[PDB]
Design a binder for this molecule. Structure first.
Ligand code: 9Y1
Ligand code: 9Y1
Ligand code: 9Y1
Ligand code: 9Y1
Ligand code: 9Y1
Ligand code: 9Y1
Ligand code: 9Y1
Lengths: 329, 329, 331, 331
């Protein structure tokens, strides 16, 4: 005789079918959350962090916008049981490099955090895809793969996905064309060591390198190499200006989530286990174009690289392995 | 010739059709911006604020996500020339009240702030609609109206649009129905003095007040009055938990922008000049259900209120006019 | 080494079942309008089409496939054999005879019950866990039939019902008031057909009761003749059939609206055909439209609408008409 | 007072001109597929439909209006009189004569000229600043016809051209490679249909040239017969026509993609038909497809694709063939 019962005759006393979890509710985690919500990718969104008030506040702020969304359940908690049955778990938590801190010790601190996060995630969603966004993303994708025990197709790092998107943005600005119609790939290690593959840059299938052979070289009077320099530094420039980056990474991560959740088999440059390619013999993750879908990475595109490009990926792999073999799991 | 000229033959060396400006790039302003971008409402987005570094960093972060959007131009600056020819200008900038500072003094500081912002907006977009999101929104909508010289249809306050969305969310939680199918209106002055119109709360046209006469009274065993208390205290609780609120207000503003930009003539509870209704005789703005379209507010719905509800709106109007008549423009 | 081999290194060999497959049965105008609407709303990762006319079927499938670049549904299949429908979450039935000019939907019963005797066991055979969404006419009777033949629990057998009649009512309401239909609220319940019931006592804008403002609303004495709005709703399909030969776009959008609530588990309320036994003192197993909560398990709840004496009498008249047919069917 | 005036206080009497209006001319299968695709992509705040068959036109308009609840395009209008199209940003022409048994290409085009002599001036009268998007076949010649009659500058007269051929090519390429067509790049240029030119040099996934990986790509001696993909781009259209009677859905989706770039000023590149005199040794006023930057002023720029000698010869032969017909037309 409650109001609910006077109004509603229940037929069914009835698990989520398209659930995504975001771990970490810093600026990056919440940018991923809002972008996923506005793209209607999930029927349930779970948020996890260790700061309880901030977590609850973010969950409530999203819930209050429910009228404008098509995601009918948003939940959160410090307890990983709220993440149960996720198709996709996006990891954005972890430690930032501090003053005086080595890359090795920063990574070790993140190993120690992932040793708590990842087994809890795996416990409640043993068949999920893990999408690692935390930096340094290539090494932390390896760390998540090692700790989770997942097959390599289900452990994906966001890698050079945004680097590539920035590259196409800058390309489009130079040419006066939408980035959607400007094509070009940044591969390898995310960050300062990434590799712009000049041979693949094109508009409508017309090779810029063929039209303009000095493209990307020191002799280039248009200094197109400065485009890749800008890609590397634009992250730093945004951090210097507003303190951090968030929006572009959130959009780029939602794009990856779309391909996975909707089984699109679109090709994205993400970090994946690259052993066996380009002379690399160690268990390291680097960005190459991957086909993304329901089972994670199902296929790799084998981009033809020059000797110099290949040597740069090899050099990155050697460094990554050099750090990885010193980690304590 | 340059690479561009070898690649591209230009036919035309020829103004935005659907431009939106957001003034203020704090958390609320940026939530409005990302929500508008992800809803494909604008062909150009302009951001303005007085903090030049933050401003440029936010613009760049959004620009870097261009590949994932359908808004081909994002601009920013401290100079309002970047806002030229906007259809819709959303104001989120304003003062924060100081300890010991009277409400009157606070509003006067907002007046002085708007005496800079609004004339510069009007210079560059004389035919825009103004959407005021800054709190205290009902008074500041009056202030924008007076300073702009705009007809009242083109000056809209976000008002109780989000309070009503929160109400419907809470209603939906109690009933197990999506908020889209839970109907109910919070009207009047945004904040603690707002009015939940119990007579209008329904699912599928079934009045809850009819089924449950004690609805919203102190005699209510189900304590539905707590739902409106929760609405009123929501921003408070979220601010206490995470420091501020942003996502819900961004989504609600993007919903208002959708009706305006697409000429939908949907009904929203927004703040509008209410002189002539409910025995109100002064130039005050409060929320009532308004028809929103390409000319702003073209019509408003005359909601039948109980004597108590009417008295509350009247008391709010008296309080608003008491402050407004002391303002120096 | 083939070109594909040189270009792509494969990690995973095994293809998996789709997560969100939808089947549309029947590729007439209604079925194809449902298909394009569902495709453009991104509700499925696989769309299957089934019909008995093989050329037309293959042609429609290819036409949609050629638009794949512009869609986000990576697999579209078709076949006369129902094995192409396996593992569907939602199966939308649009097949069967349709109304000619001036013809009642009720005139289609014999033809479409006989088609359903073939279709429904084949659907259930390949997707035993699907939700059935019945669109073929007369939709209320055929929803009862699909429920009886399938042996499904009634929550998983949903008729498109009066979702469309209510959409038309709200459109006409919006035209009269100068308000978008989204903000005009009014329900048409009962048969999707001539005996439908407008619930005047529930109509409102912004929670303001129109019958309270206008006590003659929906009566013969009404100086504004709002009954004409419901009369236009009843006559809509006839008028469109007379003009263009059939209806398609509005029903396609109505069905996609229902599919969205089901596939995304929204628990939005829609007037759809379901068993109303136990409401308004009705004891028969009659199916007709009342507001239902719709989600991933189909109909999980009924909203109990308070009707005036006249509205309830009209709804019971509608139920008597439909039950007079449904009771005589033989399974 | 009326119920409306009791309920609603009016602030504004608005005589306001459409801000984002699209007109579709012709309400056959192609025109209505363009209409529904545009509606479900929210590209327009007003949609106008025009044709000469009045009952069919009214029926289509009503069927779309009845689905308004499910749309975000608040005004849908129609009429045989072109005053309903006034102030359109974009006018899509799908109307025209269909080729009859035994009829020459010249006679078919001339019948379309005669129809365009009615349609095009009426469009120009009411929307003198619109972009014209020609979809009627044969599209390259009728884009020329529309250009000559309208007297528009060539940036504002666009033929749908090889946009759909390229989409079909990418669908077929994706099927072969097991990759979404969004990630399979390849351009079909030149004359729409049988004489179109697949640009093998541009075919790629992730910037990896297939022709560089597989030098036989596109040739007769190719063991993998990739040339068959382009043969199927040509043949699959005829196959759809044979099987269901006509093509409609893929055209509609591809036209809505073009509309999206134009209405939202995206400056995306599309292979559309444009006046090509001065390129590739072409010296006549003919329209052929090349990659064009599309935005609010129509075609603002075009991409200069490097073609082999064989590819250039094929464009010239098409240009001679088209000009061969155009020079015989009576305007
Ligand atoms: O053994 C250790 O050092 C250890 C074990 S857990 C841990 N974690 N975990 C988080 C965390 C987890 C999830 C989030 F969503 C966000 C943050 C933060 C830390 C801390 F700051 F390093 F302490 N450290
Ligand atoms: O070719 C090799 O094996 C090789 C090439 S560089 C290298 N590096 N680099 C570092 C290092 C760098 C930065 C630090 F802050 C701290 C340590 C340490 C080593 C080493 F393995 F111990 F040798 N090894
Ligand atoms: O928005 C972006 O792309 C972004 C935001 S921070 C970032 N990071 N983070 C690291 C890093 C962090 C810790 C290490 F121990 C080592 C490296 C390097 C980069 C960069 F790509 F080079 F910029 N990138
Ligand atoms: O800042 C740091 O901690 C840091 C920065 S590079 C680094 N490296 N690098 C290598 C390496 C590199 C190349 C090789 F060919 C072989 C090994 C090994 C390490 C170390 F053990 F972690 F120290 N450490
Ligand atoms: O006393 C009352 O309020 C009352 C009780 S029944 C009633 N009804 N019922 C119908 C009706 C019923 C079924 C139809 F199929 C058609 C019409 C018409 C009326 C009315 F008189 F016009 F109001 N009114
Ligand atoms: O003098 C002539 O031959 C002539 C002059 S107008 C004409 N038109 N026009 C249309 C038409 C127009 C717009 C549509 F949207 C659809 C069709 C059809 C014909 C026709 F009768 F079939 F030939 N013919
Ligand atoms: O869906 C499509 O692509 C499509 C649908 S009809 C079509 N048409 N139309 C003609 C044509 C028509 C009249 C002529 F007088 C001459 C030619 C040729 C083609 C074709 F591309 F080769 F297939 N294409």
């Amino acid at each position: 005789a409650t109001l609910k019962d006077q109004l509603i005759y229940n037929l069914l006393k009835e698990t989520p079918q398209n659930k995504i979890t975001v771990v970490g509710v810093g600026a990056v985690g919440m940018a991923c959350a809002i972008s996923i919500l506005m793209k209607d990718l999930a029927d349930e969104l779970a948020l996890v962090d260790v700061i309880e008030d901030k977590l609850k506040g973010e969950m409530m702020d999203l819930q209050h916008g429910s009228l404008f969304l098509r995601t009918p359940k948003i939940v959160s908690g410090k307890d990983y049981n709220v993440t149960a049955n996720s198709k996709l778990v996006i990891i954005t938590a972890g430690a930032r490099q501090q003053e005086g801190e080595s890359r090795l010790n920063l990574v070790q601190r993140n190993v120690n955090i992932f040793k708590f996060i990842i087994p809890n995630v795996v416990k409640y969603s043993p068949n999920c895809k893990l999408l690692i966004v935390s930096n340094p993303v290539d090494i932390l994708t390896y760390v998540a793969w090692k700790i989770s025990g997942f097959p390599k197709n289900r452990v994906i790092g966001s890698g050079c996905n945004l680097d590539s998107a920035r590259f196409r943005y800058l390309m489009g600005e130079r040419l006066g064309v939408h980035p959607l119609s400007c094509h070009g790939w940044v591969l390898g290690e995310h960050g300062d060591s990434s590799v712009p593959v000049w041979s693949g840059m094109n508009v409508a299938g017309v090779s810029l390198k063929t039209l303009h052979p000095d493209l990307g070289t020191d002799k280039d009077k248009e200094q197109w190499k400065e485009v890749h320099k800008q890609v590397v530094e634009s992250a730093y420039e945004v951090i210097k200006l507003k303190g951090y980056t968030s929006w572009a990474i959130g959009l780029s991560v939602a794009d990856l989530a779309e391909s996975i959740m909707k089984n699109l088999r679109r090709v994205h440059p993400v970090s994946t286990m690259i052993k066996g390619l380009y002379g690399i013999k160690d268990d390291v993750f680097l960005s190459v174009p991957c086909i993304l879908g329901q089972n994670g990475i199902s296929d790799l595109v084998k981009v033809t690289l020059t000797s110099e490009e290949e040597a740069r990926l090899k050099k990155s792999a050697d460094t990554l392995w050099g750090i990885q073999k010193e980690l304590q799991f």
